[PDB]
Nucleic acid binder design. Sequence first.
RNA 1: GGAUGCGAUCAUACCAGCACUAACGCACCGGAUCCCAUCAGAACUCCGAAGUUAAGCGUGCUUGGGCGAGAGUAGUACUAGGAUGGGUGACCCCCUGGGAAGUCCUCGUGUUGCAUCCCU
RNA 2: AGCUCAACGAGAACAGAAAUCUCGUGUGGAACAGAAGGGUAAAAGCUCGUUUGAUUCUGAUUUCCAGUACGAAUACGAACC
RNA 3: CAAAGGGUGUUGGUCGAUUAAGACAGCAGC
RNA 4: UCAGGAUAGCUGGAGCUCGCGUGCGAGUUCUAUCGGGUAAAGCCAAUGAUUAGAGGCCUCGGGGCCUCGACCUAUUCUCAAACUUUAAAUAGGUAGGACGGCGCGGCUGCUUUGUUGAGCCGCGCCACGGAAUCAAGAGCUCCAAGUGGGCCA
Lengths: 49, 160, 46, 207, 163, 278
Amino acid sequence: QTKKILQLLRLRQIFNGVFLKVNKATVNMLHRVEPYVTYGYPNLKSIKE
Amino acid sequence: LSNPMRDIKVQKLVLNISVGESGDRLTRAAKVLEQLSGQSPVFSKARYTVRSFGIRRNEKIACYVTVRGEKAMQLLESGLKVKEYELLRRNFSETGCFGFGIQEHTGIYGMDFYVVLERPGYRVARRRRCKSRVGIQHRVTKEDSMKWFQVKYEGVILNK
Amino acid sequence: NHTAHNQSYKAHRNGIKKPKSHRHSSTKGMDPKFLRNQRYARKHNK
Amino acid sequence: GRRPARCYRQIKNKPYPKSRFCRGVPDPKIRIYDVGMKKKGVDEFPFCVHLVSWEKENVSSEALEAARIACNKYMTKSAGKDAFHLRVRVHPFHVLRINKGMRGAFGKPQGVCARVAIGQVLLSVRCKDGNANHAQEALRRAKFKFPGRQKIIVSRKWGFTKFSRTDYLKYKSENRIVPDGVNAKLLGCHGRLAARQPGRAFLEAAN
Amino acid sequence: PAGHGLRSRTRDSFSRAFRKKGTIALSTYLRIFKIGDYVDIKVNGAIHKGMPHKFYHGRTGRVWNVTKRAVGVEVNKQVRNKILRKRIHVRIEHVQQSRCTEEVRERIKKNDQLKADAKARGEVISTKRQPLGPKPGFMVEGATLETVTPIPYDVVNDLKGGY
Amino acid sequence: AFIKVQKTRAYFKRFQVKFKRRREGKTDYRARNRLINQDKNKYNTPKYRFVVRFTNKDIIAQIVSASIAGDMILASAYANELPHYGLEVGLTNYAAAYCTGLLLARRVLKKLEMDEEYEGNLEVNGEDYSVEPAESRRPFRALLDVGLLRTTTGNRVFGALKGALDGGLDIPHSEKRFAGFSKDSKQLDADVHRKYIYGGHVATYMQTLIEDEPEKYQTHFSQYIKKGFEADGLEEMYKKVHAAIRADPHKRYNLKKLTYEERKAKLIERLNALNSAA
RNA sequence: GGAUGCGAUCAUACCAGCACUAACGCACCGGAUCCCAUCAGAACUCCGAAGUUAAGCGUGCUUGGGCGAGAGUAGUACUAGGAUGGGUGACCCCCUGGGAAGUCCUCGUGUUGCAUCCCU
RNA sequence: AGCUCAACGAGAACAGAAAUCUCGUGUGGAACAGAAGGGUAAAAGCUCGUUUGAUUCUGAUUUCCAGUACGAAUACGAACC
RNA sequence: CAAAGGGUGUUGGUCGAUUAAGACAGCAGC
RNA sequence: UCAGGAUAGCUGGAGCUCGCGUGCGAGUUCUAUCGGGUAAAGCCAAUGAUUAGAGGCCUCGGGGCCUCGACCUAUUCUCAAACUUUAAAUAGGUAGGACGGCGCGGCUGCUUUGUUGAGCCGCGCCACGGAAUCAAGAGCUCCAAGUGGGCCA
Ligand SMILES: [K+]
Ligand SMILES: [K+]
Ligand SMILES: [K+]
Ligand SMILES: [K+]
Ligand SMILES: [K+]
Ligand SMILES: [K+]
Ligand SMILES: [K+]
Ligand SMILES: [K+]
Ligand SMILES: [Mg+2]
Ligand SMILES: [Mg+2]
Ligand SMILES: [Mg+2]
Ligand SMILES: [Mg+2]
Ligand SMILES: [Mg+2]
Ligand SMILES: [Mg+2]
Ligand SMILES: [Mg+2]
Ligand SMILES: [Mg+2]
Ligand SMILES: [Mg+2]
Ligand SMILES: [Mg+2]
Ligand SMILES: [Mg+2]
Ligand SMILES: [Mg+2]
Ligand SMILES: [Mg+2]
Ligand SMILES: [Mg+2]
Ligand SMILES: [Mg+2]
Ligand SMILES: [Mg+2]
Ligand SMILES: [Mg+2]
Ligand SMILES: [Mg+2]
Ligand SMILES: [Mg+2]
Ligand SMILES: [Mg+2]
């Protein structure tokens, strides 16, 4: 299950990163791969860099 | 309470002769009821085999007949006349019924007299459609049956 | 004696394969009385 | 003879009670669960102290009787034959099997034991406040008869009732308590009104 | 067969609900079934004819045939790496009309009119539903604040109702 | 000695009530299920029931179709409205049942706008009759729903069945239960059946009492005498009624549930009275 | 506002006790020639309309039982995922989530379709 | 088609714990060939009436499962009852 | 690998009792 | 038949049919809806097991009017893989359009009292793609190897 969800998030390699819109559908997917990822709210500086 | 529809009456009279064995005795016993009641009696069969009583299952061991109407009254006074118009207080059931037994009456056979008292309107519990229960106040009680016997035949109830 | 170990992994190598769904499905096994009338209705269709 | 208790200390199998499927089970060692003055009224013994289990383990019926006898003897001497009521709160309903090679190893019934949980009361004693010290000491001796770790807790309830001592006096002062031997019945505001007595009819529930 | 009968392990699945035995209400026999409808298979334990195998109990299928007393139902069944389309006939006592698609028909009409109302004004829109999104900011009026703190421990309370 | 209570809490907890109509003793759901259950490959094809019910003083006839919300009445006919056609007495006998069935048949055909194509039986001779199909339309079909009565030979319900058949309705049936059918001969006696249709059996009994028990005749047929109906004139009366049928076919007295406040107030009064006692 | 016939939902509709009902009904009820029916005209069947609302049916009531709903039990029991977490072990805390059930307490005691008729 | 069972309560010559008969209560506490489970009350139980669908002709489906056979079962069609 | 059970070893904590109206130890004649 | 073989699965090779984001695909979630009887719970609910007193003490037996036990009523301790009213978490099924919808006509030997239904057909009109995320793409066929002793958490 975790393997499939990480693929749907396009996180196929350690330390890969992606943006993700917030909605109940996506948040519940993320909840099921909690120990394999870390995430948060990126500020303008982070998005630019 | 004094409505005409509350008048007590004899619903039926049942005469039971439990000879306790098949054969000629049962045939003779049945003939006694037929002439005494004017209708063919029914032959009852033992429910379970009992060696102590000497009866086998599904064997005719008794005969009874049901009588209604005037002949029930005519045949009921004769039984009470033999009984001297006296009954024990325990002979009346809680459901407004009473019975007695004679042992003198082919031969001589002892009979079992049981009387069912009912008021008009008991059909509600006997009909097939909208079968219901008779109201509690309208049912014949133990006290009502005793009073009926004390006014219908001016009999006596011996507590003993 | 028996075990289902590794069998789900084998099934998912190329599966789970859903059957191909076509617009029209086979009429085999349907009520012959209904089917026979339908054939006559198409015969006289114009 | 009987195996050491360590062999069946841990709860490893599903409950295996005596039934039409398990036959030839020996009787439990413990057969009496109430000792002392068990006919005393609810108002006689306010104090109550429990021997509470602190582990999840099997307790053999043999150990339960030994604890009851040990607790009973000390309490009788220390306080008297009519100054306490001891109740065993655990019943052994689980049957232990023994396999007397490994072909067809399903064992025959050996004995019985009780499947105790964490925080479950093992023994209870009710008496007067003056004998609280003796009651606790009696349970201390019984602790050495059990395999696991237990704890002595002084109950805040009136004897074996389910009411707190403060609530029991509150209800009794209001005339809402109907003694029922060792139990106590609380009168509410339900049921046929004619069933109540002049001084035992209430408009609101006991809250 | 081969170690298990047709109704093996159906002690609970095929038993009637508590205090719901005896006569079957006649609304069951007044249902109308058409080709293409979705039905949920729920075995009634009192009717022993036309009853589906225990596997199909609790499954939803599509109606592909209608007979005098039964409906043909298509049910998906996973066998190893494939899904099979199992076609079974079941007496109508064991089938309930499913509400799995109850929102589709009413949703299409609303989408059609919304697009029509938007086409006349030359405003391209989308009728797609969306999952719950993040809430916007707002102000909450101040009120009395109740302070919550951890409770001191008491052993006597480590039991339902206390010791 | 003291007897254990039979109806305890446990008894009521596990008790399952039967259907309201069943415990009221009015509906046989085994028969009802087999009467209304339509083939699923017929979809929304109503299955009409010819419902005939007899009360102590009236006959009720209805054409009924089943639905989820309840039964729908297509047409109804009551024997109590036969006086509008001429029949004043014997509204529950065999002849009245025939008239009630005939009236329903003409009314339903009138409602379906097919009464001209099917005129029914024009020669009522007591023989078994079944309306032959017309050219461009089949006859209306209905099923007899007798209810909880005993389907005995000569039963009034089959008298109403004959009237419906003579009215032009297709009702599956056999002649084994019409009045006049013989168990041994296994044949239908038309003369006896025709006798019952026109109340001949009622007329025969009226004449029997006159010759033997005139006093009983006055009481047993008081309403017949009160309206100048004789035994020999009943056949002509019914034949006239049949022709007429084909020619043209809030104050509250019950207590109201007490409100919560009223019920509570009365409870307090009883509570205080009980406490003040003793 | 109700009754009756057929119903739907199948206890908020059941069970027990007590009380009450205008009109039309529904009943009880009268009889046993005919159809039919039995040991038995009790039932079933047929014919009838003298009597009675006594019962049934209907309605109301009960600090009634049951049933239904809420609150509470309780973020408790249990549980998915996590840890080179604690502990000798038995077991357990914490982290990311889901989350019951008796007792006790309060309230409720049917709703409704078609047709006919009464209140009119 | 009609009927209602187990059990209990209160009654009746011989008759009693237990023969037969009467009334009342009775959600199945009975019965349904056999193991167990499920199911069933104007019935699937009990008693009577009439009977042979325990029939003829294919095919389809389910269970087993390789989606083979056999056994068993189910839903139709065309006949005769 | 280690247990039940123990320590006036030592370090924290919880409840209770006593004490400038004189406690505790020793000393003195309660 | 049990140290084997065949069979299906897993695997390779050969391709073929298409597709380029408008994908109709997914070991994921969301929305709606359906099934369940494990964990827990329950006995103060059926069935079974089981501790103690209390009241009533009518009626039955026991012994010596007394008296113990049976009985009845309301309570009470403790239980169940082959008990259960209730009842999770996790997991299971279905659905979320172009294979949609509407309008007007037509066909039938099936169906209806009934051009009443049922399914199908023709014509016309409408249909911003009808949850999220992803889609190193999707489908189809042929021939064949190895394997059919497993082990660990
Ligand atoms: K210990
Ligand atoms: K097995
Ligand atoms: K039958
Ligand atoms: K009885
Ligand atoms: K220490
Ligand atoms: K529970
Ligand atoms: K229990
Ligand atoms: K191989
Ligand atoms: Mg040793
Ligand atoms: Mg084990
Ligand atoms: Mg084989
Ligand atoms: Mg297998
Ligand atoms: Mg069969
Ligand atoms: Mg019938
Ligand atoms: Mg009579
Ligand atoms: Mg009345
Ligand atoms: Mg109540
Ligand atoms: Mg069985
Ligand atoms: Mg078969
Ligand atoms: Mg230690
Ligand atoms: Mg080798
Ligand atoms: Mg191979
Ligand atoms: Mg669920
Ligand atoms: Mg299971
Ligand atoms: Mg279970
Ligand atoms: Mg459990
Ligand atoms: Mg090998
Ligand atoms: Mg192997």
